[PDB]
Amino acid sequence: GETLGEKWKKKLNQLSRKEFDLYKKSGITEVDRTEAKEGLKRGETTHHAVSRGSAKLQWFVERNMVIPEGRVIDLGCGRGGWSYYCAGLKKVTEVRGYTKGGPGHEEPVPMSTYGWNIVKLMSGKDVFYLPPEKCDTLLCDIGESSPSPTVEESRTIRVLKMVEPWLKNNQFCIKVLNPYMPTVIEHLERLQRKHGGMLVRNPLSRNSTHEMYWISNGTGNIVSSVNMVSRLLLNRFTMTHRRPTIEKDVDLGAGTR
Numbered sequence: 001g002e003t004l005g006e007k008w009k010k011k012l013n014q015l016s017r018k019e020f021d022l023y024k025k026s027g028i029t030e031v032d033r034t035e036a037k038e039g040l041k042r043g044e045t046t047h048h049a050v051s052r053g054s055a056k057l058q059w060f061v062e063r064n065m066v067i068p069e070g071r072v073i074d075l076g077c078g079r080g081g082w083s084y085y086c087a088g089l090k091k092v093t094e095v096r097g098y099t100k101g102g103p104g105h106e107e108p109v110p111m112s113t114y115g116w117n118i119v120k121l122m123s124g125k126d127v128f129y130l131p132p133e134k135c136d137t138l139l140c141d142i143g144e145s146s147p148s149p150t151v152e153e154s155r156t157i158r159v160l161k162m163v164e165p166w167l168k169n170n171q172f173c174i175k176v177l178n179p180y181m182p183t184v185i186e187h188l189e190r191l192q193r194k195h196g197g198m199l200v201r202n203p204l205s206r207n208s209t210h211e212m213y214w215i216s217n218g219t220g221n222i223v224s225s226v227n228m229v230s231r232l233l234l235n236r237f238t239m240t241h242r243r244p245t246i247e248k249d250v251d252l253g254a255g256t257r
């Protein structure tokens with residue numbers, strides 16, 4: 001070291017509140033969640049995504065980076081945004097979501113968006129002790145940020161260690177909270193050797209996170225991709241502020257499959 005990502009993290013931790021709030025959205029893409037949030041406030045159960053996560057996963061799926069099919073397991077499903085998005089996909093036959101829930105954590109949100117009847121979301125489940133199950137698609141969006149990159153390093157490696165027993169001849173999309181710490185890079189290189197895939201930056205991620213996703217389809221140089229993200233995020237500190245690109249949120253429809 002020290003890595004480009006660690007330099008980015010230092011500068012991020014130096015920002016004031018107003019500088020941070022400007023920087024985190026500068027030049028990013030984001031979905032307009034206003035209508036959806038009002039719908040959830042009213043208890044509406046059709047069309048709305050339960051989180052910004054549905055659109056986030058959609059970005060990967062529309063580029064065939066992960067192609068949900070068959071039995072989908074969603075580790076750390078939270079409200080269920082990834083699960084309910086997958087439930088509407090023709091090739092998907094079953095969605096099982098597991099999440100901790102309870103105090104301080106999001107509970108699954110019951111919905112009747114398209115394909116809801118093939119979704120089972122289970123709260124009260126600690127995925128770090130959950131025996132691996134056969135699945136055709138493995139999703140995991142777990143990783144708690146911290147101002148400390150070393151804390152994030154341990155959290156990230158713990159997530160990667162937990163998800164690996166679930167991976168075998170299947171599609172996957174796994175969040176890598178901190179991909180730039182050298183120990184994480186080494187684990188990712190061994191993981192790519194065992195299971196393939198590639199590390200990709202989602203443009204709906206805010207500039208305040210260096211998160212990248214390990215997706216199953218394709219290949220590439222992990223260090224080069226991480227460093228590309230680090231340079232982008234570093235340059236956005238001094239780039240003139242740019243308003244984010246606002247897109248419409250996803251419409252997940254209604255009814256049973």
Ligand SMILES: Cc1cc(N)c2cc(NC(=O)Nc3ccc4nc(C)cc(N)c4c3)ccc2n1
Pocket residue numbers: 075076077078098099100101104105106125126127128141142143
């Ligand atoms: C306040 C808050 C913030 C988040 N980013 C959350 C994410 C989630 N999504 C997750 O996957 N969370 C999560 C988060 C941390 C976890 N830790 C262990 C040891 C086991 C788990 N099954 C587990 C799950 C859930 C609740 C959240 N609550």
